[PDB]
Design a protein around this ligand. Structure first.
Ligand SMILES: NC(=O)c1ccc[n+]([C@@H]2O[C@H](COP(=O)([O-])OP(=O)(O)OC[C@H]3O[C@@H](n4cnc5c(N)ncnc54)[C@H](O)[C@@H]3O)[C@@H](O)[C@H]2O)c1
Ligand SMILES: NC(=O)c1ccc[n+]([C@@H]2O[C@H](COP(=O)([O-])OP(=O)(O)OC[C@H]3O[C@@H](n4cnc5c(N)ncnc54)[C@H](O)[C@@H]3O)[C@@H](O)[C@H]2O)c1
Lengths: 338, 338
């Protein structure tokens, strides 16, 4: 309708992170949920006075549900979608889309057949400062992008096989895909794994070659020592102030975009443009609803049939990059992208 | 003597940058100079009431000169040293040492034969904060270095074959060589060249593999838009406060050193240690004499026969890395190092 009857599949962390968006946004009503855990079902049914179910089989059979936000573990993503599609439901699934490229192909096909929209869940490439930055790149005001440099140093690895590559490199790659705006053509990466305790790849650095000359360097460190939010005006990833409650925009650490005539540096509270004149802080409005840019995508895809940017085909390319990384670090070698 | 009779070959920029050190440091007396340009000679002779000369042939023949700070263009470095050595003078030559590896080999040999010290001039790897950081790594307090991430965004390219690689990547490589402390084994680099006006390689990003696992990412951008000193407590490269008074230490932009149990972040005014419990800012003393760490190296090499760290064999390895970079960017393949 005017308002959008939304069903949630998977009632954990992704869900709770997404939760204050869903309430606050006038265009969204939560109408139904599913989870295997009944205490979650008990939970949801109570707060929302709404039907709950064991499987997605339940939620997708409910005629009152217009689209399903799939917010469960990665390995269920593909199957869950294939079903929601079967029953004519729009899908918003969380990063990563899926673990495999095949999975992705199927997901996009199952959705194309059922003729329903497929969007990928809060990616940080949705955040206003970045979208605002891409606008500046779009305008051609600073000429084209030549070099992107992005870092993030977080406590993720200690927040209470790939791990950081698939969850965290995704956000990072998606922002750089967003901002450069051309295709990724080659990737070269090093992962670090140096805590026995938490024996996963906890940091990386990578080089990306882009179509038409631009290149990018991405570095992630998750071992929770240095906190890169110091260089983002002491605003946390979810918009809250960490400085030593009207939140700010979301981000994924320090990014610098170098274009021919200038440097763009998006912030949670503004976008700085370093130019031929000099410094410009063009400030941003305090987001009224957190992560509302995700809803707009969904809302306008379903109500007004507008191609969403962050569709299944986009997400698939980011994943492609994620795999290429882990292959580069995995072997000794570069990975060209066909 | 107690004091050190020093002769200067080449009286331009490097010289003037080094000049307030030379005056202020009690252990150094300027006694002689040479330059081809007589207005420079006129200049030096007047301020310092001292003998000046056309060639280094002159300065090296002066019996009163104990060592020569060679601060001329790169292509003269080798020859000038060969001579100063021939005449038994110690050499402090400016980055880069030389242009070629052969040149380097000869320089070190000419100096080993004449049995005189050879040190490479103000490298930023001399700066207190970095030396202090290496101390922390030395102590083993944080376990070994795993990943180094270093960036610098400057106005160098517009300050009134590959210019930034040899001048600027040198400082950067030297700091990372300093701090990791093991051998560089492989390099992969991308340079950008995007101003027709100033058609040089003005930016790069690189991956460095080190002996025994650690890796590093270095990024330089010289096109003078964004200023990375924002993230160094708004203190300039030569210690002056940018912001909105005795100087502070020298630096070369934001560096983060990740060791197994924590992250070290050197600053011009302190060294931050992030580890278990909290932030630690261990502060530093305001340098009494700018770049005094260069003099100590020289002074202790000549008076007290202490092996200098930044010797000709060190500088040669940095240059080796610098060449490897320009080869990687040049060919788009990796470069292993022997
Ligand atoms: N971009 C973001 O904001 C963000 C946040 C965190 C994680 N994520 C994504 O969200 C996903 C889920 O959130 P989370 O894992 O952080 O929290 P979580 O593991 O606590 O929540 C997921 C829950 O979904 C339930 N679930 C629903 N349908 C299921 C099914 N068919 N099979 C099994 N379990 C099912 C499970 O009970 C599980 O506990 C992650 O796998 C990841 O893809 C992205
Ligand atoms: N780390 C640092 O502080 C720093 C600073 C700037 C540049 N550098 C190094 O300093 C070197 C020289 O300083 P600069 O180039 O910035 O200033 P510059 O070019 O104005 O000064 C060098 C001067 O040396 C004189 N000279 C002396 N002997 C000479 C000879 N035999 N042939 C020709 N000229 C001779 C020339 O007159 C020349 O002008 C550079 O090549 C570079 O290696 C490093």
């Amino acid at each position: 309708g005017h308002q959008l009857r939304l069903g949630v599949a998977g009632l954990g962390r992704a869900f709770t992170l997404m939760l204050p968006t869903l309430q606050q946004d006038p265009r969204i009503k939560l109408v139904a949920a599913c989870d295997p855990r009944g205490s979650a079902r008990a939970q949801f049914a109570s707060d929302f006075r709404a039907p709950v179910y064991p499987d997605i089989e339940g939620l997708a059979s409910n005629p009152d549900v217009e689209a399903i936000y799939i917010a469960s573990p990665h390995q269920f993503h593909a199957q869950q979608a294939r079903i929601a599609a079967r029953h004519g439901k729009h899908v918003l699934v969380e990063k990563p889309m899926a673990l495999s490229l095949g999975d992705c192909d199927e997901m996009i096909q199952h959705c194309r057949d059922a003729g329903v929209h497929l969007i990928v869940g809060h990616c940080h490439s949705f955040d206003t400062p970045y979208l605002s930055a891409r606008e500046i790149v779009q305008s051609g005001e600073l000429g084209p992008v030549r070099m992107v440099h992005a870092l993030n140093y977080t406590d993720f690895l200690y927040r209470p096989g790939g791990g950081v590559v698939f969850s965290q490199a995704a956000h990072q790659v998606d922002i750089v895909r967003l901002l450069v705006g051309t295709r990724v053509r080659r990737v070269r990466a090093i992962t670090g794994d140096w805590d026995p305790m938490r024996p996963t790849q906890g940091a990386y650095s990578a080089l990306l070659w882009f179509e038409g000359g631009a290149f990018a360097s991405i570095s992630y460190n998750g071992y929770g020592h240095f906190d890169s939010d110091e260089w983002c005006d002491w605003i946390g990833e979810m918009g809250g102030d960490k400085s030593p409650q009207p939140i700010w925009h979301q981000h994924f650490g320090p990014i610098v975009v170098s274009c021919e005539r200038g440097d763009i540096r998006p912030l949670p509270d503004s976008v700085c443009v370093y130019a031929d004149l000099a410094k410009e802080r063009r400030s941003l409005q305090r987001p009224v609803v957190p992560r509302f840019e995700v809803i707009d995508e969904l809302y306008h895809a379903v109500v007004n049939e507008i191609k969403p940017l962050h569709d299944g085909v986009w997400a698939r390319a980011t994943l492609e990059v994620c795999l290429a990384l882990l292959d580069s670090a995995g072997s000794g070698k570069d990975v060209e992208l066909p």
